Ligand binder design. Structure first.
Ligand SMILES: N[C@H](CCC[C@H](N)C(=O)O)C(=O)O
Length: 111
């Protein structure tokens, strides 16, 4: 079940991971260590609030926060990619809170 989750979320202007996101990440860490040839692309995103520049950096910190946890957990840095899309690729349009909660995220994409 933990492995079924391919996205973790963040609070406003934060790159801190929640206790729930950590459970998810531990599952992927174990899978990646057992599958040394599996590779993952981590994409960081933000909600539409703020400049494009500000959010590109925030998205990058989010992706790297996830990357660093996996690495600390034992995942080979070679199996990981960390990139930011800033506020350019929201999953939910509309300009409201709930929607922004969905957009503050890092997606885990297996190659
Ligand atoms: N200092 C920025 C924070 C934006 C945070 C939001 N884009 C997020 O995705 O967490 C502002 O005044 O909008």
């Amino acid at each position: 079940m933990a492995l079924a989750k391919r996205v973790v979320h963040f609070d406003y202007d934060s790159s801190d991971l929640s206790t729930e996101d950590y459970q998810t990440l531990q599952a992927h860490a174990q899978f990646l260590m057992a599958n040394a040839n599996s590779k993952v692309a981590l994409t960081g995103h933000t909600d539409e609030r703020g400049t494009r520049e500000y959010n590109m950096a925030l998205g990058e910190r989010r992706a790297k926060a996830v990357q660093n946890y996996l690495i600390t957990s034992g995942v080979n840095p070679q199996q990981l990619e960390a990139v930011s899309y800033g506020k350019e690729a929201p999953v939910n349009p509309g300009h409201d809170e709930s929607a922004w909660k969905e957009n503050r995220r890092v997606e885990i994409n297996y190659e």
